[PDB]
Amino acid sequence: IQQWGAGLLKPSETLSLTCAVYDESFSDYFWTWIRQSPGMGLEWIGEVTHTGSANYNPSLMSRVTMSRDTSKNQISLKLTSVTAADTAVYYCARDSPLGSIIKRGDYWGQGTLVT
């Protein structure tokens, strides 16, 4: 899996990151974004289901925005308001839907760090 976006930012602006896959079954898996503050646990940002939808964490509901692109098989994450309290590293994670169960986060990307 590949990712890219903005590396260095300034407070009070917007951030955009893109996660791209290299397969052709990019239509039947849940795709989630994970945030990790420097050396402090982990955080769950949001997810996009199979049928082009999105569920956002209540804490960051308004700020965050997820989107897909089936033509090029990419996923876009946007944050409206950036600051110095959101410096972290972001990972792109995948979940395979089974029958009545979901194998959450069975594959993680390298991710990228933002300030």
Add this chain to the structure above:
Amino acid sequence: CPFHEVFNATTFASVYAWNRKRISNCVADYSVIYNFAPFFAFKCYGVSPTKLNDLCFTNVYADSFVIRGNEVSQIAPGQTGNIADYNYKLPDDFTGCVIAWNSNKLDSKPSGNYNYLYRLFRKSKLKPFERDISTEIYQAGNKPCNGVAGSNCYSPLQSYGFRPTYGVGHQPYRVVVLSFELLHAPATVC
């Protein structure tokens, strides 16, 4: 017998609602089905394909639908997957035939076709020769969904994405399975 219409229907039903037709009190000439030059897969269990017209059965059932190529292998008895376990189950004591041929020309457009759906969520696997067509927001976890999608509330059906540029493993294939039945009733079809 009107096998011509079943094999020449303009539109085929979705996988989760396989189209079934009954045939009885007829004269069976299966050779006509060989008019279609291409046949990606053609198999028969329990009866030799060459001696199909020399047998007598009480009746037959034709079940037709459209699937993906790489899933065509899941239409055999004693199989498992995302199709054989939730959309179409074949009992082991199977006596019939299965036919599958590509449909790239007629069932694929550049824009993307969403007319064909297949089930993806279900609590329990289907019984052999059973069907279930009931749209409902599948619920996961202890919380009740209350008929609204969300964190653990999903749509069971998934829509195939068909484009003419897809690989050979994703271009749709039309599939039809014939099941023969003979019982105490007089052997009509022959």
Add this chain to the structure above:
Amino acid sequence: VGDRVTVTCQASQGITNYVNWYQQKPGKAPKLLIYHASHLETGVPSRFSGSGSGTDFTFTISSLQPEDFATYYCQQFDHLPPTFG
């Protein structure tokens, strides 16, 4: 260290049967070791296992191979949003 180690994870409000156990290393992306209680991912040689419901989930390892030095993490599925530990 050496032979055996055991860890526990607990939930305050509400009970659940869904938890996950992930592994991490110095600067590499996390890996999922165990999903849905005892059910094991098909990448687990050295008996990484743990079974228990009722707010007292457990993680147990039979032996410490030379490549067992991580920061193993719990997780939840239900009770949105998921929270780690």
